[PDB]
Design a protein around this ligand. Structure first.
Ligand code: Y96
Ligand code: CL
Ligand code: CL
Ligand code: CL
Ligand code: CL
Ligand code: ZN
Ligand code: ZN
Ligand code: ZN
Ligand code: ZN
Length: 308
């Protein structure tokens, strides 16, 4: 056979057929299916098995492909893959979605979002898989998202939490956010955020409203105003607890709709194209206007400076 950790560097092994894989290699998977305690069948000649890293060469190759040394990662990935490879990944409005299964509504929403914003993932394994997802084969990429986010298939998922974890694995170093804070008493303080903190705000959906200002607590004890001075990023994510919100054609890129109770509710995806499209897994509706419960909105950006 061939053992690997990255499916790029293949290492030639000949096995014994009287001994389990797990005896000879440690935990060994096949296409997501744990074959640790199984022995070699005949239709196992020259196939390729993932192995837990058990020597320095494999640890270094694993870090260089996944950007983690966590010894649980591989098995969490292979356990998610074993489901994600059985999901359906329909093309809907020229985007790869996911057919509803195992509480994946939040992954479908994340996947659709990721195909409409500009993002470079640092770990090769994520970048390679993102590319393959864009081109319709997204099983691998969904398993990796589950593994990187410390989520198992069936677990209830927040889209903002998932985007936050993915952004922390993306190149957002360039990204810069300058805010000014205005209290009557303490006065005026400016702060510079970089990376993930530069593209995410929790507390309003409206990029407009962030530019005009929003009321926040001051440590003095008064109410103060936070407004956006300077934004340097290819997008921004604007998030709030779900509430009725109107979405106008052409004024945003895409949004997360969330219906029902904390945790056990369901997401759908709103995207602005030539009209508004609602993507609910395999299902597609369209309308010229939209009002409904929204918790995330994504906007395009490059360079913004305020006129205040
Ligand atoms: C679906 C989900 C999964 C996990 C979690 C939190 N884990 O720590 C949260 C949610 C959630 O209900 N998120 C939505 C979008 C949400 C986020 C924030 C506040 C909310 C208040 C009422 C109802 C939903 C609310
Ligand atoms: Cl890293
Ligand atoms: Cl399954
Ligand atoms: Cl679901
Ligand atoms: Cl990373
Ligand atoms: Zn990294
Ligand atoms: Zn399943
Ligand atoms: Zn103050
Ligand atoms: Zn769901």
């Amino acid at each position: 056979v061939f053992t690997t950790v990255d499916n790029i560097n293949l290492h030639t092994q000949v096995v014994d057929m009287s001994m389990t894989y797990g005896q000879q290699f440690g935990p060994t998977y096949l296409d997501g299916a744990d074959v640790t305690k199984i022995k070699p069948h005949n239709s196992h000649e020259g196939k390729t098995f993932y192995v837990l890293p058990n020597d320095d060469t494999l640890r270094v190759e694993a870090f260089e492909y996944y950007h983690t040394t966590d010894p649980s990662f591989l098995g969490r990935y292979m356990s998610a893959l074993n489901h994600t490879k059985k999901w359906k990944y329909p093309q809907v409005n020229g985007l790869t979605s996911i057919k509803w299964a195992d509480n994946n509504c939040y992954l479908a929403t994340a996947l659709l979002t990721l195909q409409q914003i500009e993002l470079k993932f640092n770990p090769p394994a994520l970048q390679d898989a993102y590319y393959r997802a864009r081109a319709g084969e997204a099983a691998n990429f969904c398993a990796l998202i589950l593994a990187y986010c410390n989520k198992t298939v069936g677990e209830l998922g927040d889209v903002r939490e998932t985007m936050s974890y993915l952004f922390q694995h993306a190149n957002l170093d360039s990204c810069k956010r300058v805010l000014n804070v205005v209290c009557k008493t303490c006065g005026q303080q400016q702060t510079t955020l970089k990376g993930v903190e530069a593209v995410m705000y929790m507390g309003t959906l409206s990029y407009e409203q962030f530019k005009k200002g929003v009321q926040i607590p001051c440590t003095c004890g008064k109410q103060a105003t936070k407004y956006l001075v300077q934004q340097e990023s290819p997008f921004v994510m604007m998030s709030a607890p779900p509430a009725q919100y109107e979405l106008k054609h052409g004024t945003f890129t895409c949004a997360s709709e969330y219906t029902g109770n904390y945790q056990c509710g369901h997401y759908k995806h709103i995207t602005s194209k030539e009209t508004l499209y609602c993507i609910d897994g395999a299902l597609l509706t369209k309308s010229s206007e939209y009002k409904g419960p929204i918790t995330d909105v994504f906007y395009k950006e490059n360079s913004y400076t305020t006129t205040i």
